Amino acid sequence: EATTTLFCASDAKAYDTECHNVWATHACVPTDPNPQEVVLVNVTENFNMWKNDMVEQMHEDIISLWDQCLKPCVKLTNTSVITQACPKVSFEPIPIHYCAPAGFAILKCNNKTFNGTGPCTNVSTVQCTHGIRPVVSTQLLLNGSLAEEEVVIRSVNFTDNAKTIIVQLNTSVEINCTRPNNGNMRQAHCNISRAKWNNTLKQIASKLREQFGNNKTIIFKQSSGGDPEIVTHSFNCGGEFFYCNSTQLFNDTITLPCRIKQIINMWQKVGKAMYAPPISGQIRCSSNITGLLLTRDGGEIFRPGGGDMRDNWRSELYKYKVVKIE
Amino acid sequence: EIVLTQSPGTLSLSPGERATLSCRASQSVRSSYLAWYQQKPGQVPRLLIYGASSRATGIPDRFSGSGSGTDFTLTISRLEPEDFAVYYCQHMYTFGQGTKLEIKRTVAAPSVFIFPPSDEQLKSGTASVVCLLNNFYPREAKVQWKVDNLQSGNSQESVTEQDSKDSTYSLSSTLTLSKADYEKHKVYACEVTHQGLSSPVTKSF
Amino acid sequence: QVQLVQSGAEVKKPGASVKVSCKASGYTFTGYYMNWVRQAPGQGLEWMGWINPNSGDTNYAQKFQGRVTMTRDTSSSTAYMELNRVRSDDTAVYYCARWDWGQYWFFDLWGRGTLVTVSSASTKGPSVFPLAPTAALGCLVKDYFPEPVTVSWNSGALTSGVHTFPAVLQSSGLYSLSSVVTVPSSSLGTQTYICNVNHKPSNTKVDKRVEP
Ligand SMILES: *[C@@H]1O[C@H](CO)[C@@H](O[C@H]2O[C@H](CO)[C@@H](O[C@@H]3O[C@H](CO)[C@@H](O)[C@H](O)[C@@H]3O)[C@H](O)[C@H]2NC(C)=O)[C@H](O)[C@H]1NC(C)=O
Ligand SMILES: *[C@@H]1O[C@H](CO)[C@@H](O)[C@H](O)[C@H]1NC(C)=O
Ligand SMILES: *[C@@H]1O[C@H](CO)[C@@H](O)[C@H](O)[C@H]1NC(C)=O
Ligand SMILES: *[C@@H]1O[C@H](CO)[C@@H](O)[C@H](O)[C@H]1NC(C)=O
Ligand SMILES: *[C@@H]1O[C@H](CO)[C@@H](O)[C@H](O)[C@H]1NC(C)=O
Ligand SMILES: *[C@@H]1O[C@H](CO)[C@@H](O)[C@H](O)[C@H]1NC(C)=O
Ligand SMILES: *[C@@H]1O[C@H](CO)[C@@H](O)[C@H](O)[C@H]1NC(C)=O
Ligand SMILES: *[C@@H]1O[C@H](CO)[C@@H](O)[C@H](O)[C@H]1NC(C)=O
Ligand SMILES: [N+]
Ligand SMILES: [N+]
């Protein structure tokens, strides 16, 4: 029941000029030819999403990716300033397999309705985890994994309001974001189905009602305040950062307004960073919403959360634990 | 745009002395995706080290790779006459320019010889006179062809590998020219310059 | 018996397509990646691509993308690689290696190697010329194609002091080399010397004599 260094693995193409593919070629090995998935019968082991080392490993690997592969022209910190060159490149998330090292293996809870902390009835050991697209997003979750059975809620403590609440989507909700060329290039927009989103939101509301018995008809609202990275739906699309306003979602064809920001609050450290002007023409990005990051206002009223990308990796690495062979 | 630069370009050492080859990478490379191969002249590259610092299955103990980050090192203590070969530094897909290793030896004098073209060759329309420098160690000798008082652009030279027996090199330079211009001139000479040679030895016919 | 057997040497013209096959026998074919590496004559190594024999997904470098196509045959346990728009720069020795998926990246097995030669000239046999005269004596193997040539002295009887120099390509595209030997005067006068030149690509055996 120990922990050690893992190594990334992905079926990356060495000839493509997509940023992710470059770093993968020279920092991650190809995929395992034969997948060794063994189902252990009558095994009970306690998993813990939040005190897991795999999350910090994935966090560290991603940090290096963005730096070496999506570099900022001007970085800003209270103490220091660093100026450098940032060449424009393409950027489309690819899947990454985080394999366990020779001598160790990963235990996998193979039941959808697993809360995240506690014993698992059915556990299966696999040598490599499944491909996890490393998408950095705020508020919303994108290109993620869907819950097989039904929507699931996960958190360290429903009693403590400060702790974030993570939700895994039931059916992938598609969102199609584009900045069309006419003028003012910042103005953009995302489009999302109104009826589909309303149904998914009602489903999450029902799950939250199950968490808090009496089922006080609750309503969602925009984040109170703070830096715009957590208040607004932010995500990287086509190499340019988009800060889309999620005011319509939390309350026809819903359409959100977006704005390409040059300066943004970087999540690697405590500081700011600036990037070059935007690309001139059509930018197209269509992703599958597969969950959300929400927090509870004390007093139930819920507001979007996020900002700390470690939770996103927990959402994807919740059923996986690294242990030693016997 | 990653390139592994191996240094030194050409290392020269004698048996018994520990030699260290360095391989520097532009970007900070992963710690466990590094390997070192040895290729003896005219054979398939042999796998010496893998994982930066780990002897492969069966590799002798004297070999030892080490180093992390952008700078890596391949160490060979107690050089034996068989370890003197080409060494390459490989990180996943990118190989290094290569590092040529040579057995140190005392400077030897170049046995200079010049051979005329066979009469049968002149009957074909071309003429090839050969100038041979045999058994000389430094590897940097220069052979100049001059019809009495200089030629250029038509002299092909070839060097043999390190002689296995006496650890010395041999060079043969051939300058081919037409037959008409051959009969036109009369004084052909081959000058040789070499450290071990006090003066530039000139052999001619 | 756990061997990586490659195909024989090939001679191609500019613009043709070359296909070299690497057959592996003795170990489980599908379970290990098959990598293709080439080495130009007298230069460093260069990885070209690899193929996953189990699933068949391939990977090539940017320099090759578009004109290299890799295939595998599970039935006969072989892996073929094809390279289109061949050019003089592609002349090299192609090796194939086997890597079993793991933490570390390394080439455990190496094939004997396949020699691909690309040039305009056609296959031509060598022309042997004597270099007549402790003195020396040698022979000149001039105007021959392709590269593979072997020189022996007195049918393998003479060995000591022999030096066969690496071939050099002439402006006409035909290679040329020289093989010389050092012989004292007594042996040069009492013992006859002959050059045995074998150019297998053209099935050319030559036995020339050298005398003062
Ligand atoms: C999750 O999944 C999507 C891919 O499966 C991905 O998609 C989109 O993102 C990229 C830009 O990030 C677009 O890719 C571009 O396509 C244009 C048009 O050919 C290229 O010219 C351009 O250089 C680049 O390849 C994708 O085309 C678009 N998906 C589709 C169908 O168009 C999502 O972005 C990803 N989620 C997140 C947050 O990135
Ligand atoms: C598992 O999660 C459920 C809520 O979905 C909760 O009732 C239960 O107490 C949790 N058990 C443990 C050990 O965390
Ligand atoms: C979780 O809530 C319980 C009280 O219900 C408390 O005992 C425990 O200390 C809390 N842990 C955290 C991290 O809030
Ligand atoms: C994005 O727009 C709609 C859904 O909002 C749909 O047609 C499709 O998912 C996307 N459009 C195209 C051309 O792909
Ligand atoms: C969630 O999935 C279950 C079926 O497994 C279904 O009962 C429920 O209606 C689904 N809700 C949504 C929004 O898909
Ligand atoms: C988002 O939209 C609402 C109404 O349009 C507005 O009140 C709010 O200030 C907007 N927030 C941002 C960051 O644009
Ligand atoms: C969101 O709901 C509030 C009332 O609760 C309303 O004022 C506002 O107009 C709504 N926004 C949209 C886009 O419908
Ligand atoms: C600079 O100042 C504050 C406090 O020192 C800090 O929280 C912030 O992260 C730093 N970077 C900024 C404001 O861009
Ligand atoms: N996968
Ligand atoms: N962001």
PDB file of N, CA and C and ligand atoms in Angstrom, chain A residues 66 136 229 234-236 241-243 264-265 267 309, ligand 10:
ATOM      1  N   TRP A  66       2.740  22.617 -20.013  1.00  0.00           N
ATOM      2  CA  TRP A  66       2.352  23.984 -20.346  1.00  0.00           C
ATOM      3  C   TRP A  66       3.567  24.893 -20.486  1.00  0.00           C
ATOM      4  N   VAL A 136      -7.239  21.845 -18.864  1.00  0.00           N
ATOM      5  CA  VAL A 136      -7.305  22.852 -17.811  1.00  0.00           C
ATOM      6  C   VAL A 136      -8.549  23.698 -18.049  1.00  0.00           C
ATOM      7  N   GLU A 229     -10.599  34.081 -13.136  1.00  0.00           N
ATOM      8  CA  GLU A 229     -10.360  32.698 -13.539  1.00  0.00           C
ATOM      9  C   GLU A 229     -11.394  31.762 -12.927  1.00  0.00           C
ATOM     10  N   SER A 234     -13.414  29.649 -17.815  1.00  0.00           N
ATOM     11  CA  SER A 234     -12.195  29.874 -18.576  1.00  0.00           C
ATOM     12  C   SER A 234     -11.610  28.540 -19.021  1.00  0.00           C
ATOM     13  N   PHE A 235     -10.996  28.548 -20.200  1.00  0.00           N
ATOM     14  CA  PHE A 235     -10.427  27.344 -20.786  1.00  0.00           C
ATOM     15  C   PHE A 235      -9.619  27.745 -22.010  1.00  0.00           C
ATOM     16  N   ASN A 236      -8.658  26.897 -22.366  1.00  0.00           N
ATOM     17  CA  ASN A 236      -7.793  27.139 -23.514  1.00  0.00           C
ATOM     18  C   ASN A 236      -8.413  26.503 -24.751  1.00  0.00           C
ATOM     19  N   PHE A 241      -6.604  31.747 -24.993  1.00  0.00           N
ATOM     20  CA  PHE A 241      -7.392  31.555 -23.784  1.00  0.00           C
ATOM     21  C   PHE A 241      -8.738  32.255 -23.924  1.00  0.00           C
ATOM     22  N   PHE A 242      -9.807  31.552 -23.561  1.00  0.00           N
ATOM     23  CA  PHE A 242     -11.164  32.076 -23.631  1.00  0.00           C
ATOM     24  C   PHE A 242     -11.734  32.180 -22.226  1.00  0.00           C
ATOM     25  N   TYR A 243     -12.293  33.344 -21.903  1.00  0.00           N
ATOM     26  CA  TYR A 243     -12.922  33.605 -20.611  1.00  0.00           C
ATOM     27  C   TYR A 243     -14.411  33.826 -20.858  1.00  0.00           C
ATOM     28  N   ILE A 264      -3.663  36.688 -17.899  1.00  0.00           N
ATOM     29  CA  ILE A 264      -4.489  35.780 -17.112  1.00  0.00           C
ATOM     30  C   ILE A 264      -3.718  35.357 -15.872  1.00  0.00           C
ATOM     31  N   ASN A 265      -4.461  34.937 -14.850  1.00  0.00           N
ATOM     32  CA  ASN A 265      -3.870  34.444 -13.610  1.00  0.00           C
ATOM     33  C   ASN A 265      -3.437  32.998 -13.819  1.00  0.00           C
ATOM     34  N   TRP A 267      -2.102  29.289 -13.161  1.00  0.00           N
ATOM     35  CA  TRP A 267      -2.327  28.337 -12.083  1.00  0.00           C
ATOM     36  C   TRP A 267      -1.058  27.613 -11.650  1.00  0.00           C
ATOM     37  N   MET A 309      -6.467  23.267  -9.989  1.00  0.00           N
ATOM     38  CA  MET A 309      -6.591  22.190 -10.963  1.00  0.00           C
ATOM     39  C   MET A 309      -6.323  20.815 -10.366  1.00  0.00           C
TER      40      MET A 309
HETATM   41  N     N D  10      -7.201  29.576 -17.934  1.00  0.00           N
END
